[PDB]
């Protein structure tokens, strides 16, 4: 098995546009995800709220849809609850709350795109193990 | 001349093998002075070099405790380089501390190497002031007194920092942790020495329970004066008869007493960094074990209450409250396994506590986002991790590179305190046997047991 | 319970005092060789 | 005119840096191949086709996780000879099938025979009684029961221990979860013999070293001993009085003391081997029937014995799908036993 | 005179003629070990069930309440108590004290004081006998290990309910939970511990067999060879040159001890240092610096995890984790 | 009757010989890996050879006597 361009091709938006990530992009996304997110989202779960995971099918049913680059980049700027009704930047790391989540302070647009691409590619590699928790370890 | 055994630095002259070679120094005051000063250089070298390494690796926007730092936390706790909430506002004080220790270690190393190999091997012929005989009890208490005075000055330097040169970092500062100048140190001896008579068991915690900087500073005012007074005392007196008859008077005996002392201090430091979050602020060292466990219960209380749960009336599977229950003396505390940690206190939690324990009205209405943030952060930085620094429980998968500074500092100092207790036993037993004249074995022609009546 | 507590405190204090004053009573000289310690 | 057998006997028994002997003809090749096989396999050879596991430095494992793993369960108890019907002379396939496991186990067994024979041979040539050989029967009983009899009773070599650090730890936990091996009195006697042997080792060495006679002037006392001296170097009389007054009893006979130091660990290992022979057949000390009758009828009755069975049930359910891949276990999330929250 | 009557007492306390040495350490050791032993025996036989995990789920430890020798234990004090000291006089009644695991605290605290004084007492008598002083240094290894599991580990985890449970099956429960929570098998200090006890047993058998192998002939074919040694004889009873000649040929010459003092120092040092490290393993996993974690360390070119034996260990650890104390956790992480 | 090792390893002749043979053996072992030959001698998967691109199942041997042909089939399904 290999990390191919096809594996690295992920939805850019809800309209069906795709983007093919570079291997460097994916690796940067993995590194930045560890830096800023893995303390709560290791392996695709959510330690402080296990009901919501990072599976693509879960992201697809969030409001607005989070199963694409633009959706995930927007989430990292202005996170909401799963139904989109409430903005939660005060308790979830984001560019909007980089004052209180300092690890977000230096993230560029390119960095957010890389993190988003990691979240979409990882279940393409790991399948149900991503977001699976200890049952799938 | 051209003989390998021609010096006194061999087993033939000294009676000690190479693996006990530093025992050849017991009665060589000059070279032994060199060894001590050179070793001081090594300590100071490490403080300086390690700080610069930490600073070179330091990313000021990540928490210190995500970065394997143990020295910069010590400097920051003194109020250098940090602002509200423990945020780093200036790394230059860290740089200064590192540089000045590193430069100073060169001076100590110079003097150590000089005294160890070039200077006079024994000092007594050169100076009656610096020369000494281990069996000279007055000289021994005089040198002890000098060093007691030095230690008292050291304690007063902390006070000077806290009261006149910027203050200290106060995790408890009203409105949020911040640097604060201490103006009213606790001088009341009933408080200061009350700590020394507290039980070390749960809910009491002996001196490890010190929970405010006024007691810390006032305690160091007391230790400073006590040490200076005791030092003057020991320069002006010699041991009383009852002390003379109680102790062994030899270099190795004195070493053994200090080893027992340092072992005890090491065990105390282990508990201090594991439990105390006042002089080891969680902003710099990460949450304590009790703290992170409490923070998990707080996190899911917040989450579930937001979903509509009545956390006061929610019965858990055992019949005890799933979120809230009573301690054995009735205080309202967090439920689940963290019932054991109800003695925990921390600034993010105390706003929710009233006279009866956790206040359900405040829990329902007054939890702020910064408290939810702090509890989530501390729950996810619990001091659990692997030896290769994989953070989390032992079943965690690789991803998070984390072992808490509290775990590094507690484990190292338990290991060190333990071997120093072994060293105390070793050298105390040897000093007794050597003073009595049988540390090399039983005299075949005068075996004590052969002169004793049989047991039966 | 209060009578038990006082009893145990006295008992503990008694044995600890024996230990401390015992080891203060010229223990270095209680050996088979050099007793001028 | 001597005869080639005696001339060979002469050369084999020459006093040289490494004694050879007749026993060396068996010992040296088998020990070398067993050790060489383990180093070769842990450095270069996978366990992908037998276990679904990486197991070599070449694949990225470290010293703690490398192993030479057992063959697949489908091999049964095949000798798995290089020229046998499974590998058919193909060295690469032989490695992929697990042939290095039986290679190491069997050369290892014959090497251990060679070593015990060496102990006999050297004792006979030097003229001492062969108690060292007799004591070595305990390592042999352990190796034979654990690496040969146990898998021979089970379905295949697959369930023998794999030759690796972490692989052996897995074997320990498997024996807890499936056999409740800690509850077995033969294992308990083994534990007593090992910990009791280590106790005897420490206390005897410490006692000798702290009842030495002063036979020199040095503060380091090792130099004050002469191998040819007639005298004891420490005082048996003072040691006996010390332990009599500290512990209540003491050795008084040096010969018994040293035989007892052999007897305790040797007997303990022998007992543990017997328990493993039972486990070859799943003849476990798994349960106490009276405990199970009471707990089944009385849901308030709980002991540490019932608590440990719940742990065993967790081990079995959560480790079996990956640990026994030939079974193709699929345990849906909902059937996995687990407590609250975790 | 007070000073004479006191000196008579000191002379009796420190007397080398008492069948069992008392000494000043013995003045503390004797009452504390007696209190711990008496309480332990009574509790092991007759104590009612104890709510070890503070969830009103009492575990029966005593023989009279349905245990045998293998399953019985004295059960730790309740998780609701944590590290609080729980003496009898802080309980409303003996009934309450028993429900909450009071006996365990009384036993372990008196026992620990007692074994530390036992260690000092080993120093003390050696001093009275004119011996060298380091037998208590050897005994410090088991003392350190007992202190790790009865005191340091519960302190680090915040509760005596997590200390070693005082029974045979209770010990196994402690061990299995410990493996899930610290991966102790993958911790190098436990590995050193194993080398210590495996090696100690090996060297005991080795030393025992080599001395036994070279006993000098002093008995007839009928009597035990043990009669060939007489207690207190001056001459050595075996031929150490013969023993060395065998062992140096078994391996190679320079691998064998010909110095009996070096040999016996090694016999002391190997198990003692090994057990020191074992004890430090428990005492540092007490602060959650845990065994090596190689879970998912091996990854293929695409990013799939390739399991190692470390991952199989992890599956067993998880099975223990999810099952242990099955009613005690309400939140997703077991953080102590 | 043979020379002590300490005499041998402190002699110039020993180090003239072994300053060549020890590095040569080290380099040959290096190349055994770096050329990839170690993979093919022992049959160890390269990082891209544990799984085919679509399936995520282990090529476990299930047939005792046709295991050799079974491995040969699992390998042909990779490329
Ligand atoms: C004369 C010389 C000989 C002396 C011997 C005398 C015999 C007694 C020996 C002491 C034994 C103590 C056992 C209990 C120790 C303990 O529970 O220690 C814990 C206490 C701290 O207690 C904790 O203290 C805490 C204080 O924190 C509180 O205050 C903080 C303020 O920031 C925070 O707010 C925090 O959240 C809040 O809870 C709380 O009170 C906790 O409830 C409480 O449990 O540490 C402390 O008292 C510091 C003392 C620790 C000593 C450790 C000894 C270990 C020795 C090991 C030997 C190894 C083997 C040797 C072999 C040879
Ligand atoms: C102390 C001594 C000192 C040290 C000595 C060390 C020397 C080492 C050298 C010895 C190596 C022996 C290898 C034994 C291999 C073996 O057994 O291989 C096993 C085979 C049997 O084959 C097995 O047979 C099983 C049952 O099959 C049978 O039943 C099936 C179901 O119906 C089918 O019908 C099948 O066709 C039918 O054959 C399964 O097929 C297994 O997969 C298959 O491996 O027996 C056989 O070769 C021969 C069996 C009889 C001889 C056994 C003597 C040796 C073993 C003694 C220990 C016994 C352990 C019992 C447990 C306790
Ligand atoms: C903290 C570590 C430490 C220190 C400070 C010392 C210090 C000392 N040792 Mg001990 N020793 C140690 C560890 C230490 N030792 C250890 C770990 C062992 C076991 C291997 C020993 C075994 C041992 C034996 C057997 C003996 C000593 C002796 C000595 C003394 C004389 C040394 C001498 O004459 O060397 C001469 C060596 C040289 C001249 C070589 C150069 C040495 C210098 C000091 C190196 C300086 C390097 C440094 C980078 C320079 C910086 C310069 C810059 C600041 C300007 C000296 C006071 C001897 C003694 O007691 O004499 C009475 C003695 O016989 N030691
Ligand atoms: C109080 C002592 C102490 C403590 C608590 C720490 C703690 C830490 N160090 Mg520091 N450090 C220390 C002393 C200490 N160090 C010393 C003496 C040096 C000079 C070598 C350093 C140089 C150093 C560097 C260069 C780095 C650290 C780093 C770190 C962090 C990662 C630790 C790690 O991965 O260890 C791994 C654990 C081991 C290697 C285990 C060692 C086990 C020893 C050998 C056991 C010894 C037992 C006893 C002492 C000997 C007894 C023998 C017996 C026979 C008597 C952690 C915060 C890292 C960091 O993150 O910095 C930002 C880092 O890069 N440290
Ligand atoms: C505790 C450490 C210590 C002690 C007890 C000594 C003691 C001695 N030294 Mg040594 N030395 C030391 C450290 C020490 N030195 C260091 C760190 C260096 C490197 C600079 C040297 C380099 C050195 C040399 C080159 C010589 C000596 C000499 C001597 C002898 C005569 C000293 C004298 O008469 O000064 C008289 C006192 C003064 C002149 C005033 C001293 C005031 C000092 C400088 C400042 C004190 C401030 C404060 C207390 C320091 C705190 C430091 C702390 C933060 C670490 C005497 C035995 C001489 C000797 O042995 O001749 C044969 C000699 O030639 N020393
Ligand atoms: C480095 C610190 C240090 C050291 C090593 C010494 C050493 C000495 N002192 Mg000095 N002393 C010091 C600091 C020090 N002192 C200070 C700072 C002061 C001012 C307060 C004094 C005031 C002082 C006086 C007035 C006297 C001494 C005396 C002595 C000598 C015998 C002391 C003794 O028997 O201790 C052992 C202690 C005892 C035998 C008392 C019983 C100890 C109990 C049982 C131990 C309890 C410990 C507890 C568990 C640990 C903390 C818990 C507690 C807080 C509740 C000895 C040379 C005596 C002497 O002859 O001087 C000329 C003496 O009369 N010292
Ligand atoms: C001490 C020497 C020794 C011993 C005891 C073994 C033992 C073993 N080897 Mg190892 N091996 C050795 C040295 C040894 N090896 C060396 C030096 C090498 C490197 C060349 C190897 C390389 C090797 C490989 C590659 C393999 C083995 C394997 C084995 C196992 C199967 C052996 C077999 O079936 O042989 C059968 C052959 C014999 C038993 C020969 C017996 C000859 C008889 C006695 C002659 C009788 C003649 C008769 C009297 C004449 C009658 C005449 C008539 C007309 C009257 C067995 C455990 C296999 C294995 O481990 O699989 C897992 C395997 O694959 N060995
Ligand atoms: C006696 C003896 C000994 C010991 C010794 C010792 C221990 C010594 C020490 C010494 C020392 C202790 C030294 C030190 C030194 C130091 C130095 C020399 C430093 C310098 C510094 C610098 C040069 C810096 C620079 C810088 C800056 C300024 C800034 C930042 C950057 C940098 C870092 C670059 C021994 C063991 C051998 C044995 C024999 C005898
Ligand atoms: C700073 C501070 C503080 C304070 C502190 C203090 C004030 C302290 C003091 C301390 C002290 C004040 C201590 C002391 C100690 C003591 C000791 C440690 C003793 C010991 C003893 C001994 C060791 C003895 C022995 C013996 C015996 C018993 C018998 C006889 C013989 C002999 C002598 C050997 C506080 C906490 C507030 C807070 C924080 C900060
Ligand atoms: C199998 C087989 C075989 C054989 C082979 C061989 C015989 C091999 C050998 C091999 C070898 C023979 C190898 C070796 C290797 C080695 C190594 C790989 C080493 C390493 C080491 C190290 C790494 C070290 C470490 C350490 C220790 C251990 C302690 C001290 C410290 C140190 C760190 C030094 C044959 C052909 C018959 C056939 C086919 C099969
Ligand atoms: C940190 C808390 C500090 C609290 C204050 C501590 C003060 C300590 C004062 C120590 C007083 C010592 O008191 C000491 O007791 C015993 C009483 O027989 C004496 O001990 C004496 O015992 C016998 C005679 O019976 C002799 O063999 C021995 O040589 C002699 O020393 C000491 O000679 C005496 O000086
Ligand atoms: C303005 C035209 C409307 C379509 C283009 C703008 C919205 S595009 C939209 O971006 C969202 C995050 O912002 C995602 O939820 C969504 O999947 C993505 O398609
Ligand atoms: Ca000399
Ligand atoms: Cl459990
Ligand atoms: Cl919980
Ligand atoms: Fe012996």
Residue numbers in the entry:
A (entry chain v): 1 to 137
B (entry chain c): 18 to 473
C (entry chain i): 1 to 37
D (entry chain d): 11 to 352
E (entry chain a): 9 to 344
F (entry chain e): 6 to 84
Sentences from the paper on this structure:
pmcPhotosystem II (PSII) is primarily a dimeric membrane protein complex located in thylakoid membranes of various cyanobacteria, algae, and green plants and functions to split water and evolve molecular oxygen in photosynthesis. Three psbA genes (psbA1, psbA2, and psbA3) encoding the D1 subunit of photosystem II (PSII) are present in the thermophilic cyanobacterium Thermosynechococcus elongatus and are expressed differently in response to changes in the growth environment. To clarify the functional differences of the D1 protein expressed from these psbA genes, PSII dimers from two strains, each expressing only one psbA gene (psbA2 or psbA3), were crystallized, and we analyzed their structures at resolutions comparable to previously studied PsbA1-PSII.
Compared to PsbA1-PSII from Thermosynechococcus vulcanus, all of the 28 amino acid changes were observed in the PsbA2-PSII structure. Our results showed that the hydrogen bond between pheophytin/D1 (PheoD1) and D1-130 became stronger in PsbA2- and PsbA3-PSII due to change of Gln to Glu, which partially explains the increase in the redox potential of PheoD1 observed in PsbA3. In PsbA2, one hydrogen bond was lost in PheoD1 due to the change of D1-Y147F, which may explain the decrease in stability of PheoD1 in PsbA2. However, the D1-C144P replacement slightly distorted the main chain structure of TMH C near D1-144 in PsbA2, and the change of Tyr147 in PsbA1 to a Phe residue in PsbA2 (D1-Y147F) affected the structure of the side chain itself slightly but did not disrupt the surrounding main chain structure significantly due to the similar side chain sizes between the two subunits. In PsbA2-PSII, D1-P173 is replaced with a Met residue (D1-P173M). Due to the larger side chain of Met, the two water molecules cannot stay in their original positions, so they became invisible, whereas they are not changed in PsbA3-PSII due to the same residue of Pro in position 173 (not shown). The radius of the Cl-1 channel of PsbA2 calculated showed that it is narrowed due to the larger side chain of Met. Our present results showed that the structure of the Mn4CaO5 cluster, the arrangement of water molecules, and the hydrogen bonding environment around TyrZ are very similar among the three PsbA variants, except the narrowing of the proton path in the PsbA2 strain.
